[PDB]
Design an enzyme around this catalytic site. Structure first.
Site, PDB file in Angstrom:
ATOM      1  N   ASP A   1      -3.628   5.840  -5.123  1.00  0.00           N
ATOM      2  CA  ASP A   1      -4.878   5.214  -4.758  1.00  0.00           C
ATOM      3  C   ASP A   1      -5.453   4.361  -5.901  1.00  0.00           C
ATOM      4  O   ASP A   1      -5.964   4.873  -6.914  1.00  0.00           O
ATOM      5  CB  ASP A   1      -5.897   6.275  -4.362  1.00  0.00           C
ATOM      6  CG  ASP A   1      -7.219   5.668  -3.965  1.00  0.00           C
ATOM      7  OD1 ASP A   1      -7.205   4.549  -3.407  1.00  0.00           O
ATOM      8  OD2 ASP A   1      -8.280   6.282  -4.220  1.00  0.00           O
TER       9      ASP A   1
ATOM     10  N   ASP B   1      -7.143  -2.154  -2.106  1.00  0.00           N
ATOM     11  CA  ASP B   1      -7.153  -0.705  -2.190  1.00  0.00           C
ATOM     12  C   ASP B   1      -5.963  -0.071  -1.478  1.00  0.00           C
ATOM     13  O   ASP B   1      -5.877  -0.054  -0.245  1.00  0.00           O
ATOM     14  CB  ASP B   1      -8.437  -0.117  -1.624  1.00  0.00           C
ATOM     15  CG  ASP B   1      -8.567   1.368  -1.970  1.00  0.00           C
ATOM     16  OD1 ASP B   1      -9.142   1.657  -3.042  1.00  0.00           O
ATOM     17  OD2 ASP B   1      -7.960   2.196  -1.289  1.00  0.00           O
TER      18      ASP B   1
END
Ligand code: 8V9
Ligand code: CPS
Length: 328
Positions: free
Chosen positions: A33, A213
């Site tokens: 992430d 992201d």
């Protein structure tokens, strides 16, 4: 020269990669992430149902474990996990370093995400000042120890039923992309966020914040912008959930265009539609959700990254974007 961890697709929505914690090389599956900056693994001390099917970390079996025990809670948009800090050797691909991470003992605040998915933990690839506990990012730390050439990493995402993916640490490999690689300067100190004009048909937002992201399996759009896009589009909202369904071949579905003085990036419906034939014949869900940030913002999540190879460069404070090769 570069270290390459393989990325496995999970039901063409998520992807994971493996890494190890402990000198006895305890294996874990991570969500990788870019939008967070802490590493965590579930502990053998975990008291909650979600841990039942996971690979769990046992500090007692690692000779390189260093006790910390400072209590911590990680708050994500999809929920919270809590535990305490520990230090141990973390190995990513062939590279190792002593690293501070969170030993998670309670995952009940992270349901149903946790139990429904096959990952064990989250490995953050963000900026230091976004971390809890002032942890230097893995890639920055690896560069500082001269274990890699550059403080950068790249994502070449897997494509369901076509090819595997790679998180590459330390350098940019030509094999992952075609055409030009364009660098977009970060517009913020601690997010992988860049400024782009956003166009969807007649609708546009000048100089929008765009966050690339890796942990978000959608494109997120400002809610008023989304409301305009969906007007007379013949899509239907799923009861109780922020998702819209459409006939897959709906010719009104628009193409996202994002532009900078440097580059132009597009996202056609084929990249943001998810087939749901089991729910009905010729039906798709849009991988798009409405979200308002204080400043108008898009998250360019996993659908964007499936099309576009991305480079996250700490030293040059930029995101590099290029068309991903369809095959290796
Ligand atoms: C700095 S630390 C983590 C940070 N904390 C915060 O902002 C504090 C915060 C906590 C609660 C809250 O009400 C608001 C705020 C956080 O959570 N940033 C997230 C990115 C983010 C940020 C803002 C908006 C959206 C998403 C994080 O990088 C990330 O990718 N996540 C969080 S876990 C995850 C790895 C499973 C993934 C996630 O949820 N994916 C789902 C998602 C999300 C959105 C749309 C569709 C879908 C589907 C799924 O893919
Ligand atoms: C980030 C915002 C929070 C807005 C806010 O904080 N106000 C919230 C509002 C609705 C939330 C989603 C939905 O719940 C459906 C779904 C449930 C899964 O389990 C986890 C994933 C997913 C996509 C959720 C993620 C995220 O959490 C969303 C986008």
């Amino acid at each position: 020269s570069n270290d390459n961890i393989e990325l496995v697709d999970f039901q063409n929505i998520m992807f994971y990669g493996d890494a190890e914690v402990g000198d006895n090389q305890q294996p874990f599956t991570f969500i990788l992430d870019t939008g967070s900056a802490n590493l965590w693994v579930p502990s053998v001390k975990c008291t909650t149902a979600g841990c039942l099917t996971k690979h769990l970390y046992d500090s007692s079996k690692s000779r390189t474990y260093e006790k910390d025990g400072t209590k911590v809670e990680m708050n994500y948009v999809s929920g919270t996990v809590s535990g305490f800090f520990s230090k141990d050797l973390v190995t990513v691909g062939n590279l190792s370093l002593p690293y501070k991470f969170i030993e998670v003992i309670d995952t009940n605040g992270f349901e149903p995400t946790y139990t429904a998915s096959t990952f064990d933990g989250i490995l953050g690839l963000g900026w230091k000042d976004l971390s809890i506990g002032s942890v230097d990012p893995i890639v920055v730390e690896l560069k500082n120890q001269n274990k890699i050439e550059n403080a950068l990493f790249t994502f070449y995402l897997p494509v369901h039923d076509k090819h595997t993916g790679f998180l590459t640490i330390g350098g940019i490999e030509e094999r992952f992309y075609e055409g030009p690689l364009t660098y977009e300067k970060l517009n913020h100190d601690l997010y992988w966020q860049i400024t782009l004009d956003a166009h969807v048909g007649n609708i546009m937002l000048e100089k929008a914040n765009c966050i690339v992201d890796s942990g978000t399996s959608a494109i997120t759009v400002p809610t008023d912008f989304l409301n305009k896009m969906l007007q007379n589009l013949d899509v239907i909202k799923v009861p109780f959930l922020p998702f819209y369904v459409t006939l897959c071949n709906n010719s009104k579905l628009p193409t996202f265009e994002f532009t900078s003085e440097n580059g132009k990036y597009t996202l056609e419906p084929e990249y943001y539609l998810q087939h749901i034939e089991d729910v009905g014949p010729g039906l798709c869900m849009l991988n798009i959700i409405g979200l308002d940030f204080p400043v108008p913002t898009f998250i360019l999540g996993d659908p964007f990254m499936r099309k576009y190879f991305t480079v996250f460069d700490y030293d040059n404070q930029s995101v590099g974007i290029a068309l991903a090769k369809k095959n290796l």
